[PDB]
Amino acid sequence: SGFRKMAFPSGKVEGCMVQVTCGTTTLNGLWLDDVVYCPRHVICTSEDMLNPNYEDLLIRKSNHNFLVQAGNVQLRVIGHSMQNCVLKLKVDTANPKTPKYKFVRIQPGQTFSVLACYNGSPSGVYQCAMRPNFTIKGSFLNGSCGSVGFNIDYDCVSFCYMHHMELPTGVHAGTDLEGNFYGPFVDRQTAQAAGTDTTITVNVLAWLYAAVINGDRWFLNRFTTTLNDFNLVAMKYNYEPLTQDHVDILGPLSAQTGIAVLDMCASLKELLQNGMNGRTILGSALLEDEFTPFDVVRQCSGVTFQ
């Protein structure tokens, strides 16, 4: 029993974390095969970040201007390239710890595990989700840029995020492993708005399904509702509009617990309109939307990786 915010095992990703220094700016890099991926603003100074021309700033840089460090071992850069907002550093050595990997671009609401790193060394690992405004609520100090988010399929690491920035609201933003930002954010030290943060409705429902599985079921009401009527209440509370695909994904969870998806939507509707009255659900005093439906199925069945 028990249900917790769980992160994937980070061992396979630790072997791919290196330090990247250019000039006097340092951050983390992802070393897969003979290529190192890092945020492109490693070439910028503090003055450059106010308004950088990355093409012009990169022209003044050669292969020997990039200090790629893996423990005590220096890596020889034999080629550099800018793919959107990430830098690709070709090195003369393949990573001996390269796992089976792919580069995927996750959709809003999907979760992934972040391995926070500083100077190419891992400090911790935690789980977070792509908010509908394409931000994430993580823990990132200075030097944490280059840290990657990932999912694991048994033996295949699915890289999907790389940290680039902290918005002035204390929230974070970044790119995929091809350099394309999640959302309307640019790697530049200027004021940027994150947009309205909405709640991942399908994730709250799966979380409520996990509570029922783990004995916590006081919130189960006596009502039901419809998709269009529940969405009328979801809009008033800035919740993501629930669709039939969201209902389809919650099917296995609805079959295991015997609670129809529309019945849980009414229990969620009453929780929005009446609060929670000081009680708790799975030890949380609010509604948790950072658990995808597969996050619940994976935890309640205990799938393994290596």
Added chain:
Amino acid sequence: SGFRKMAFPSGKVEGCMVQVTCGTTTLNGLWLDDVVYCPRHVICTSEDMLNPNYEDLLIRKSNHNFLVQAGNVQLRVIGHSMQNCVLKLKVDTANPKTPKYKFVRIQPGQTFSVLACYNGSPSGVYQCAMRPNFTIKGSFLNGSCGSVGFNIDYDCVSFCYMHHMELPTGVHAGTDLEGNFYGPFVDRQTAQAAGTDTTITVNVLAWLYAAVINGDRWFLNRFTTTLNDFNLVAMKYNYEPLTQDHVDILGPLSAQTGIAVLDMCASLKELLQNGMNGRTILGSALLEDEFTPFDVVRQCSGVTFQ
């Protein structure tokens, strides 16, 4: 910025996880040097768990009755021994991935990272604390026994927990790596009480110190209080009695934020007496006590490991 429940990198512990099968019972084991550690009730059947005589049940077992598996490789058991509630299986092979390690017995309130495993393969990693009643609130399905909790000091893994049981209250219990249980729990399928669960007061204060560092500071009141007067309110809410050692540990946090420890105790006192009025602190709608003061200092300074 940002503050999250973070777990240590699990890579060094993944290399020490093996599968242990005895008869038709299987669980996880910890393979360090030429010794494998596993919960001793791997020798029990479902009928044996109701009231086992582990000494008598172990006598009928020899070295070849233990199937220690590490991936596809079988390990040859050349010796077995019962140290309290754990079994020590001597094998003919040292673990090539043995990290620098120690066996420590943590005190109540201390936190550690749990690496959940099934069939000797890691499934996830999460952070939890030793509750004052010597339980933990984790996520453990059948087969998760043998999973270990640990802390990391740069390059030294400090093993401190191994999962053995789930109490009928849905909460968990286990031993250290020497076989001694945390609390008054015995590895036997009988009704056992966990005792009154109190709140780790010094951990809530450090968590409130982390919120002030991360901009969330609305809870800072205009009052102060004394140690004996705050403990009078702490007793009414089943909070751990705060001592001068607890104040001493919160010193560095009190110096960085400029808030005296006694001032924060009054802000915590008002949060206990008046609730939280629907607001949130660091995204949580209740008081979080699973963050030690060093957990805050470590996250706000970003210490690394390898």
